[PDB]
Amino acid sequence: LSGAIVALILVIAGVIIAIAVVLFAFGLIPGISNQGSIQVLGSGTITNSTASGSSRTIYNITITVKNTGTTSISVTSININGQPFNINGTAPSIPAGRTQPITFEVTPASGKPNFSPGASYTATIYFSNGQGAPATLIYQG
Amino acid sequence: LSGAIVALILVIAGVIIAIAVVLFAFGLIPGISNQGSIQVLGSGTITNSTASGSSRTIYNITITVKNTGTTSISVTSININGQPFNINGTAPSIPAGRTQPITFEVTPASGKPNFSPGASYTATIYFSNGQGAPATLIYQG
Amino acid sequence: SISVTSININGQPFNINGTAPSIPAGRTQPITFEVTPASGKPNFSPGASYTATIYFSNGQGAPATLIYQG
Amino acid sequence: LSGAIVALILVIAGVIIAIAVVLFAFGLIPGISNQGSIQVLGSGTITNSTASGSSRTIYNITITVKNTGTTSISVTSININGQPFNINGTAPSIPAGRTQPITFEVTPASGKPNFSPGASYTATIYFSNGQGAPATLIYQG
Amino acid sequence: LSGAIVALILVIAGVIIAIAVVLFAFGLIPGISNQGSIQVLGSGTITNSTASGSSRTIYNITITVKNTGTTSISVTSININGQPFNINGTAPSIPAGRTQPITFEVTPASGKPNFSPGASYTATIYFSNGQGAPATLIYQG
Amino acid sequence: SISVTSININGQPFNINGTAPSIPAGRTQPITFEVTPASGKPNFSPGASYTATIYFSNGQGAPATLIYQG
Amino acid sequence: LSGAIVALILVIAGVIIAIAVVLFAFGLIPGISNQGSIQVLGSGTITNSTASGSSRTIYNITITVKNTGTTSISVTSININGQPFNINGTAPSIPAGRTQPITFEVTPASGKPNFSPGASYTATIYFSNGQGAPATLIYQG
Ligand SMILES: *[C@@H]1O[C@H](CO)[C@@H](O[C@@H]2O[C@H](CO)[C@@H](O)[C@H](O[C@@H]3O[C@H](CS(=O)(=O)O)[C@@H](O)[C@H](O)[C@H]3O)[C@H]2NC(C)=O)[C@H](O)[C@H]1NC(C)=O
Ligand SMILES: *[C@@H]1O[C@H](CO)[C@@H](O[C@@H]2O[C@H](CO)[C@@H](O)[C@H](O[C@@H]3O[C@H](CS(=O)(=O)O)[C@@H](O)[C@H](O)[C@H]3O)[C@H]2NC(C)=O)[C@H](O)[C@H]1NC(C)=O
Ligand SMILES: *[C@@H]1O[C@H](CO)[C@@H](O[C@@H]2O[C@H](CO)[C@@H](O)[C@H](O[C@@H]3O[C@H](CS(=O)(=O)O)[C@@H](O)[C@H](O)[C@H]3O)[C@H]2NC(C)=O)[C@H](O)[C@H]1NC(C)=O
Ligand SMILES: *[C@@H]1O[C@H](CO)[C@@H](O[C@@H]2O[C@H](CO)[C@@H](O)[C@H](O)[C@H]2NC(C)=O)[C@H](O)[C@H]1NC(C)=O
Ligand SMILES: *[C@@H]1O[C@H](CO)[C@@H](O[C@@H]2O[C@H](CO)[C@@H](O)[C@H](O)[C@H]2NC(C)=O)[C@H](O)[C@H]1NC(C)=O
Ligand SMILES: *[C@@H]1O[C@H](CO)[C@@H](O[C@@H]2O[C@H](CO)[C@@H](O)[C@H](O)[C@H]2NC(C)=O)[C@H](O)[C@H]1NC(C)=O
Ligand SMILES: *[C@@H]1O[C@H](CO)[C@@H](O[C@@H]2O[C@H](CO)[C@@H](O)[C@H](O)[C@H]2NC(C)=O)[C@H](O)[C@H]1NC(C)=O
Ligand SMILES: *[C@@H]1O[C@H](CO)[C@@H](O[C@@H]2O[C@H](CO)[C@@H](O)[C@H](O)[C@H]2NC(C)=O)[C@H](O)[C@H]1NC(C)=O
Ligand SMILES: *[C@@H]1O[C@H](CO)[C@@H](O[C@@H]2O[C@H](CO)[C@@H](O)[C@H](O)[C@H]2NC(C)=O)[C@H](O)[C@H]1NC(C)=O
Ligand SMILES: *[C@@H]1O[C@H](CO)[C@@H](O[C@@H]2O[C@H](CO)[C@@H](O)[C@H](O)[C@H]2NC(C)=O)[C@H](O)[C@H]1NC(C)=O
Ligand SMILES: *[C@@H]1O[C@H](CO)[C@@H](O)[C@H](O)[C@H]1NC(C)=O
Ligand SMILES: *[C@@H]1O[C@H](CO)[C@@H](O)[C@H](O)[C@H]1NC(C)=O
Ligand SMILES: *[C@@H]1O[C@H](CO)[C@@H](O)[C@H](O)[C@H]1NC(C)=O
Ligand SMILES: *[C@@H]1O[C@H](CO)[C@@H](O)[C@H](O)[C@H]1NC(C)=O
Ligand SMILES: *[C@@H]1O[C@H](CO)[C@@H](O)[C@H](O)[C@H]1NC(C)=O
Ligand SMILES: *[C@@H]1O[C@H](CO)[C@@H](O)[C@H](O)[C@H]1NC(C)=O
Ligand SMILES: *[C@@H]1O[C@H](CO)[C@@H](O)[C@H](O)[C@H]1NC(C)=O
């Protein structure tokens, strides 16, 4: 007598679980939309900031960043013209909804890159979303 | 003795329902074809079609539409420049195999659109077969 | 051995005129058969490709693409 | 005992349907080739072809068209200077492998076009194979 | 006492049948999971083989073919420029793991081709697995 | 400890030449074993990917991808 | 009682098989994800190697080739000016990570070339990966 009751319970539960899975599938997508929260807009600038040889060739990156997400997002790493770079201070963070000029100091990860006045160098800024925004920096130092 | 009888009933019912589900999966296929029956050809035209002191602005929209299905299909909604528009009157029907310049009247639902003479606007035409088609509309006046 | 029972072309059902072809087991063949529209009239265009579904005696249905040659 | 039987049925059906979908994906490919069968060669000519007091203006349009496919293809719509035009009469057919000067009659659908003698107009010719071709038409009178 | 023993019998039998179905599912994997395919490398050539004024047109098709699988595979059909062709004669077989220049004769299944010297035609070659490789064939005359 | 009972590579059966390798409990380790074609002579191309199903003593059949390197 | 235990068996087995398929998907990545390519740098040269009035025409082809990948790659065919050529002899192999001047002899697969001194001909060199590099070859005589 129990078999029919077990089958009934499993049928109804299967309906419920399938509907729950369907809803979860859609519930995923607003999370994934955060992968493109940030846009880097306008031409940035890179400037010599080394203090006449008193620092390990530390440069200044200024870029206008727009954040459309609901969370503050920070710059985790930067690559300039193929070369890795390391942020010298604490990472800048862009608040939600803002469009603002982020400025941060940077160091060569290896070697000593030489820049020419007025040249354009492509840099990829990697933000905490994992999003990598390409941008163009004009050297001004 | 009851349990074996119940198990027999449930086994046969499971066979029947599983076969029915498989056949339904096979039967779904023909309905998919109709999702692409229509394609919009070339640019279209928006025109201002409202009188002085009228309650509402109404725009005549003309687009060339090609239907490839067996059945007549009609427009259900249009979204121009991001704003959704509401279709006035009886929506035009596009005959089964014909290519026709179709014209229909729309009125803004979200807010007043500031169309500019001679400007080009992106739009999405949504047809009754559940198909959306990109289109480019020139505002003639 | 398996035989055709119906075909649906461009969302329109067609009836398999005549003795429906039978496909022998384990064999690859060119199969040709005549069909008539169950209702209405087709709007085929030369060179166009139409999605169809061919339904066989097991109830299984194979989707296919048919080009109209005129 | 029912669940294992149902699972067996569904597993085999899934194998069958997945293989069918893969074969359909492979079978779609030949239809893509026909989308580029036709190319328009050189400039064309528009001419005024309506009598006094007629209900409508009708323009003869002549264009050289080259067909490379196995099947005859015909014109379905034309869009001149942004305005869509409606093709009068039986649309001309372009034989499979031939290059021909084709002529057809059109009438304006959106509104009266103010063609200027000797002017050059951009147009898009839309053919029955779903292909659009840019063309340049000189208005001869 | 009967109910408990019957329920235990059905529980053990359900375990048996479920494990059998699971092992069947595991055994299906080798048949469906079959990597490797025939890859068509570079452009092939179509050459007119019809001779002596005989009634039937035959064309040589030469293509470079690389069988990445572990099984012998043969050509079953070809579609050129939207037109189907029949593989005249014993269809060529491509040995496993081998890259070969493969040449075979074809005849039009219907109609007549419109090939032009030096033109490039998109074709699809269908192999015994049902997979179909798109290729480009240049007509050499 | 669980052992490799049989292997199928790209649909073709294969036979282990030595004693079957055995994976101890809780371990993650590289199993390496010799194999022979059960029938025929399969030919592999450098850098190609071949799917193989390894059947373990549990009856579990794990699909995996092997890249030919010889 | 049988139904619940059978359902639990199938749930666990489904977890097992699904995770196995996911791991297979992860294992496919290295085979498909293969960066690096053979790059043809600058213009190459075609020189007439036919000598002694022998019946078969042979041409020297010299090109600068940079293998950016981690695998040895060889040429398989070349197409010059729309005409296929066969790589006479043991086809040259390009070692990994190396830039080399590569030279190989070719013969026309059909017909005869029409090369003119000083003319530049577009060619396509097909390598063992199936990738094909376009190049420009100058005929030096
Ligand atoms: C940005 O400004 C920097 C400072 O003007 C430039 O780098 C300096 O370049 C000079 C010559 O190229 C080099 O001598 C400096 O090096 C160091 O010198 C120190 C002594 S002193 O020169 O300061 O008196 C040493 O103590 C030290 O060990 C040396 O490494 C060098 N300075 C640094 C910090 O590298 C730089 O060229 C300029 N432009 C860019 C794009 O960076
Ligand atoms: C590939 O070769 C084919 C054979 O030469 C070409 O087809 C032939 O095309 C010519 C016209 O271009 C046509 O006259 C041939 O038709 C036959 O002609 C015979 C007499 S003769 O012409 O040989 O002197 C007749 O006896 C016969 O009844 C005709 O059918 C025609 N041949 C066929 C078999 O169709 C074809 O043009 C060429 N190119 C391509 C792209 O196929
Ligand atoms: C590259 O070199 C080729 C070989 O010298 C050139 O082809 C030769 O072209 C000449 C005419 O320009 C032609 O006469 C050759 O044909 C043969 O001639 C022999 C006699 S002799 O000419 O050597 O005195 C005959 O015995 C023989 O049967 C002919 O076939 C011809 N050679 C070949 C193999 O075709 C070619 O023009 C040159 N340039 C290019 C762009 O290929
Ligand atoms: C480079 O960026 C830094 C900010 O990180 C700027 O440094 C500031 O300089 C002003 C005076 O010019 C000081 O009052 C601030 O305290 C500095 N801030 C930090 C964090 O050091 C600098 O001005 C920028 N421009 C350069 C170096 O040319
Ligand atoms: C907009 O379209 C409407 C119909 O969709 C057109 O209305 C007709 O206009 C003509 C005169 O132009 C009248 O004779 C008809 O009685 C009107 N009604 C119908 C149902 O045809 C209108 O002309 C169009 N307006 C513009 C500016 O294009
Ligand atoms: C379309 O033309 C009509 C007039 O025929 C315009 O309607 C009125 O225009 C005046 C002046 O801008 C406004 O004060 C009224 O409010 C308008 N009426 C309505 C109902 O909007 C109308 O603005 C024109 N629309 C466009 C897009 O040009
Ligand atoms: C426009 O094209 C039409 C047909 O598409 C032409 O109509 C023919 O005109 C000639 C005289 O010019 C008559 O003898 C024929 O009876 C007409 N009909 C057909 C079907 O040929 C017309 O000539 C063209 N007009 C212009 C101005 O080019
Ligand atoms: C083409 O020529 C015809 C005359 O053969 C023109 O038709 C009439 O022209 C008068 C004067 O402009 C107008 O009042 C009528 O309304 C016109 N009739 C029609 C049906 O439009 C026509 O305008 C000419 N078209 C072009 C583009 O030149
Ligand atoms: C086309 O391919 C066929 C073979 O598939 C070639 O036919 C051979 O031609 C040679 C030369 O006359 C004969 O010795 C052989 O007996 C033929 N074999 C067959 C099977 O027909 C033909 O030469 C090829 N043509 C071209 C232009 O490549
Ligand atoms: C074309 O390349 C071939 C080699 O690929 C060269 O042939 C060599 O020629 C030299 C000089 O006569 C001989 O010593 C060698 O034995 C030849 N080797 C081979 C493999 O043929 C040929 O010289 C080159 N020609 C040009 C003009 O560069
Ligand atoms: C680097 O960052 C530190 C703080 O972390 C700051 O005091 C310093 O001025 C920055 N620049 C240099 C050249 O050290
Ligand atoms: C909207 O459409 C209806 C029916 O076609 C028509 O009667 C009405 O006049 C239209 N709106 C306006 C403002 O004219
Ligand atoms: C089917 O078509 C053929 C023509 O090829 C005709 O002879 C036959 O009568 C038709 N039969 C039916 C049932 O439509
Ligand atoms: C429109 O096309 C038809 C079909 O050829 C023709 O009879 C008719 O006259 C054309 N229109 C005019 C105004 O002549
Ligand atoms: C195929 O073509 C060859 C010509 O090379 C001819 O000898 C043979 O009879 C043809 N066979 C068929 C079935 O078309
Ligand atoms: C196969 O296994 C045996 C041991 O069973 C081993 O000695 C031998 O080297 C292996 N390979 C060959 C090629 O025999
Ligand atoms: C390739 O050309 C060379 C001439 O340098 C010749 O010795 C050799 O026999 C040719 N080989 C082939 C297969 O044509």
GROMACS .gro file of N, CA, C and O in nm, chain B residues 3-56:
model
  216
  144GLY      N    1   0.194  -0.511  -0.233
  144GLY     CA    2   0.306  -0.434  -0.284
  144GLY      C    3   0.346  -0.470  -0.425
  144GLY      O    4   0.376  -0.382  -0.506
  145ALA      N    5   0.348  -0.600  -0.457
  145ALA     CA    6   0.385  -0.642  -0.591
  145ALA      C    7   0.283  -0.596  -0.694
  145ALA      O    8   0.320  -0.556  -0.806
  146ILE      N    9   0.155  -0.599  -0.658
  146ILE     CA   10   0.050  -0.551  -0.747
  146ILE      C   11   0.068  -0.402  -0.775
  146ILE      O   12   0.061  -0.357  -0.891
  147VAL      N   13   0.094  -0.324  -0.670
  147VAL     CA   14   0.115  -0.180  -0.687
  147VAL      C   15   0.237  -0.155  -0.774
  147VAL      O   16   0.237  -0.067  -0.862
  148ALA      N   17   0.344  -0.232  -0.752
  148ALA     CA   18   0.466  -0.216  -0.832
  148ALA      C   19   0.440  -0.246  -0.979
  148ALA      O   20   0.492  -0.176  -1.067
  149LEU      N   21   0.362  -0.350  -1.007
  149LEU     CA   22   0.328  -0.382  -1.146
  149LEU      C   23   0.254  -0.266  -1.212
  149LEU      O   24   0.290  -0.224  -1.324
  150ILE      N   25   0.153  -0.213  -1.144
  150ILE     CA   26   0.077  -0.101  -1.198
  150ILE      C   27   0.169   0.016  -1.228
  150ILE      O   28   0.165   0.075  -1.337
  151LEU      N   29   0.256   0.050  -1.132
  151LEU     CA   30   0.342   0.166  -1.148
  151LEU      C   31   0.445   0.146  -1.258
  151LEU      O   32   0.479   0.241  -1.329
  152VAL      N   33   0.496   0.024  -1.274
  152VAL     CA   34   0.594  -0.003  -1.379
  152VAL      C   35   0.532   0.021  -1.516
  152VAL      O   36   0.589   0.090  -1.602
  153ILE      N   37   0.412  -0.034  -1.538
  153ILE     CA   38   0.349  -0.016  -1.669
  153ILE      C   39   0.316   0.131  -1.694
  153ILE      O   40   0.337   0.183  -1.804
  154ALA      N   41   0.265   0.200  -1.591
  154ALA     CA   42   0.233   0.341  -1.608
  154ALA      C   43   0.358   0.423  -1.639
  154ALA      O   44   0.353   0.517  -1.719
  155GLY      N   45   0.470   0.390  -1.575
  155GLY     CA   46   0.594   0.460  -1.603
  155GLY      C   47   0.638   0.443  -1.747
  155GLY      O   48   0.679   0.539  -1.813
  156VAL      N   49   0.627   0.320  -1.799
  156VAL     CA   50   0.659   0.297  -1.940
  156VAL      C   51   0.574   0.388  -2.028
  156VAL      O   52   0.625   0.457  -2.118
  157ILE      N   53   0.443   0.389  -2.002
  157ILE     CA   54   0.352   0.466  -2.087
  157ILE      C   55   0.387   0.614  -2.085
  157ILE      O   56   0.399   0.679  -2.190
  158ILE      N   57   0.406   0.670  -1.965
  158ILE     CA   58   0.428   0.814  -1.955
  158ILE      C   59   0.562   0.853  -2.014
  158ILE      O   60   0.575   0.959  -2.077
  159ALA      N   61   0.665   0.769  -1.995
  159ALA     CA   62   0.795   0.801  -2.053
  159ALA      C   63   0.788   0.803  -2.205
  159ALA      O   64   0.844   0.894  -2.269
  160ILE      N   65   0.720   0.706  -2.265
  160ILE     CA   66   0.706   0.706  -2.411
  160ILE      C   67   0.630   0.829  -2.457
  160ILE      O   68   0.664   0.891  -2.559
  161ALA      N   69   0.525   0.867  -2.383
  161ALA     CA   70   0.449   0.986  -2.419
  161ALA      C   71   0.536   1.111  -2.416
  161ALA      O   72   0.527   1.197  -2.505
  162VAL      N   73   0.622   1.124  -2.314
  162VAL     CA   74   0.709   1.240  -2.304
  162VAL      C   75   0.809   1.243  -2.420
  162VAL      O   76   0.837   1.349  -2.476
  163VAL      N   77   0.863   1.127  -2.456
  163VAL     CA   78   0.957   1.122  -2.569
  163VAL      C   79   0.889   1.167  -2.697
  163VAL      O   80   0.944   1.246  -2.776
  164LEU      N   81   0.767   1.119  -2.720
  164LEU     CA   82   0.695   1.158  -2.841
  164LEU      C   83   0.659   1.306  -2.840
  164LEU      O   84   0.659   1.370  -2.946
  165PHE      N   85   0.630   1.363  -2.723
  165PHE     CA   86   0.608   1.507  -2.715
  165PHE      C   87   0.734   1.584  -2.750
  165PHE      O   88   0.728   1.688  -2.819
  166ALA      N   89   0.849   1.537  -2.702
  166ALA     CA   90   0.976   1.601  -2.736
  166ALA      C   91   0.998   1.601  -2.887
  166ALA      O   92   1.043   1.700  -2.945
  167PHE      N   93   0.965   1.489  -2.952
  167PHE     CA   94   0.977   1.485  -3.098
  167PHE      C   95   0.874   1.574  -3.166
  167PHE      O   96   0.902   1.631  -3.272
  168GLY      N   97   0.755   1.587  -3.109
  168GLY     CA   98   0.651   1.667  -3.170
  168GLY      C   99   0.671   1.817  -3.157
  168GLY      O  100   0.611   1.893  -3.234
  169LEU      N  101   0.753   1.860  -3.061
  169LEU     CA  102   0.778   2.003  -3.046
  169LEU      C  103   0.849   2.065  -3.166
  169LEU      O  104   0.835   2.185  -3.191
  170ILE      N  105   0.927   1.985  -3.239
  170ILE     CA  106   1.021   2.040  -3.337
  170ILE      C  107   0.956   2.129  -3.442
  170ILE      O  108   1.008   2.238  -3.469
  171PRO      N  109   0.844   2.091  -3.506
  171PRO     CA  110   0.791   2.174  -3.615
  171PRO      C  111   0.755   2.316  -3.574
  171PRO      O  112   0.757   2.406  -3.660
  172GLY      N  113   0.723   2.340  -3.447
  172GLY     CA  114   0.686   2.475  -3.406
  172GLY      C  115   0.802   2.572  -3.407
  172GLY      O  116   0.781   2.693  -3.415
  173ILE      N  117   0.925   2.521  -3.398
  173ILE     CA  118   1.042   2.608  -3.391
  173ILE      C  119   1.062   2.682  -3.523
  173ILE      O  120   1.106   2.798  -3.524
  174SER      N  121   1.030   2.617  -3.635
  174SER     CA  122   1.056   2.675  -3.766
  174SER      C  123   0.991   2.812  -3.784
  174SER      O  124   1.048   2.901  -3.848
  175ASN      N  125   0.872   2.830  -3.726
  175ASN     CA  126   0.796   2.953  -3.749
  175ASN      C  127   0.857   3.074  -3.681
  175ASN      O  128   0.812   3.186  -3.706
  176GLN      N  129   0.957   3.055  -3.595
  176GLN     CA  130   1.016   3.167  -3.523
  176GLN      C  131   1.097   3.260  -3.613
  176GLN      O  132   1.136   3.368  -3.567
  177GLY      N  133   1.125   3.222  -3.737
  177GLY     CA  134   1.206   3.305  -3.824
  177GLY      C  135   1.141   3.336  -3.958
  177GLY      O  136   1.210   3.356  -4.058
  178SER      N  137   1.008   3.342  -3.960
  178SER     CA  138   0.936   3.355  -4.086
  178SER      C  139   0.958   3.490  -4.153
  178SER      O  140   0.952   3.500  -4.276
  179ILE      N  141   0.985   3.594  -4.075
  179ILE     CA  142   0.981   3.732  -4.124
  179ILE      C  143   1.120   3.793  -4.122
  179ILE      O  144   1.201   3.767  -4.033
  180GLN      N  145   1.148   3.877  -4.222
  180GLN     CA  146   1.267   3.961  -4.222
  180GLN      C  147   1.233   4.099  -4.275
  180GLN      O  148   1.161   4.113  -4.375
  181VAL      N  149   1.284   4.202  -4.209
  181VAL     CA  150   1.264   4.340  -4.252
  181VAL      C  151   1.373   4.377  -4.352
  181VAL      O  152   1.491   4.350  -4.330
  182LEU      N  153   1.333   4.438  -4.463
  182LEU     CA  154   1.423   4.472  -4.572
  182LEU      C  155   1.445   4.622  -4.577
  182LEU      O  156   1.349   4.699  -4.586
  183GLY      N  157   1.571   4.663  -4.571
  183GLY     CA  158   1.607   4.802  -4.594
  183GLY      C  159   1.558   4.895  -4.483
  183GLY      O  160   1.508   4.854  -4.379
  184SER      N  161   1.575   5.024  -4.510
  184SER     CA  162   1.533   5.125  -4.415
  184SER      C  163   1.382   5.147  -4.422
  184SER      O  164   1.315   5.109  -4.518
  185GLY      N  165   1.329   5.210  -4.317
  185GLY     CA  166   1.191   5.252  -4.313
  185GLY      C  167   1.182   5.400  -4.284
  185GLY      O  168   1.283   5.469  -4.270
  186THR      N  169   1.058   5.448  -4.274
  186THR     CA  170   1.031   5.590  -4.260
  186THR      C  171   0.933   5.616  -4.147
  186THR      O  172   0.830   5.548  -4.137
  187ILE      N  173   0.964   5.715  -4.062
  187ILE     CA  174   0.873   5.768  -3.962
  187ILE      C  175   0.822   5.902  -4.012
  187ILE      O  176   0.896   5.981  -4.071
  188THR      N  177   0.694   5.929  -3.988
  188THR     CA  178   0.632   6.055  -4.027
  188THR      C  179   0.536   6.100  -3.918
  188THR      O  180   0.471   6.018  -3.853
  189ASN      N  181   0.527   6.231  -3.900
  189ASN     CA  182   0.440   6.291  -3.799
  189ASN      C  183   0.299   6.305  -3.855
  189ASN      O  184   0.280   6.365  -3.962
  190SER      N  185   0.200   6.252  -3.783
  190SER     CA  186   0.064   6.237  -3.835
  190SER      C  187  -0.041   6.278  -3.732
  190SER      O  188  -0.140   6.209  -3.710
  191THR      N  189  -0.022   6.393  -3.668
  191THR     CA  190  -0.118   6.439  -3.568
  191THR      C  191  -0.156   6.584  -3.596
  191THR      O  192  -0.078   6.661  -3.652
  192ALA      N  193  -0.279   6.619  -3.558
  192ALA     CA  194  -0.335   6.750  -3.585
  192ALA      C  195  -0.308   6.847  -3.470
  192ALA      O  196  -0.263   6.808  -3.362
  193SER      N  197  -0.338   6.974  -3.494
  193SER     CA  198  -0.318   7.077  -3.393
  193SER      C  199  -0.413   7.055  -3.275
  193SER      O  200  -0.532   7.028  -3.294
  194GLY      N  201  -0.359   7.066  -3.154
  194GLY     CA  202  -0.440   7.048  -3.035
  194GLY      C  203  -0.481   6.905  -3.008
  194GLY      O  204  -0.567   6.883  -2.922
  195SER      N  205  -0.423   6.809  -3.078
  195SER     CA  206  -0.460   6.669  -3.059
  195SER      C  207  -0.421   6.622  -2.920
  195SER      O  208  -0.334   6.680  -2.854
  196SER      N  209  -0.487   6.516  -2.874
  196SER     CA  210  -0.453   6.459  -2.744
  196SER      C  211  -0.318   6.390  -2.747
  196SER      O  212  -0.253   6.377  -2.642
  197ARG      N  213  -0.272   6.346  -2.864
  197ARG     CA  214  -0.155   6.260  -2.871
  197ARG      C  215  -0.085   6.276  -3.005
  197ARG      O  216  -0.148   6.301  -3.107
   0.00000   0.00000   0.00000
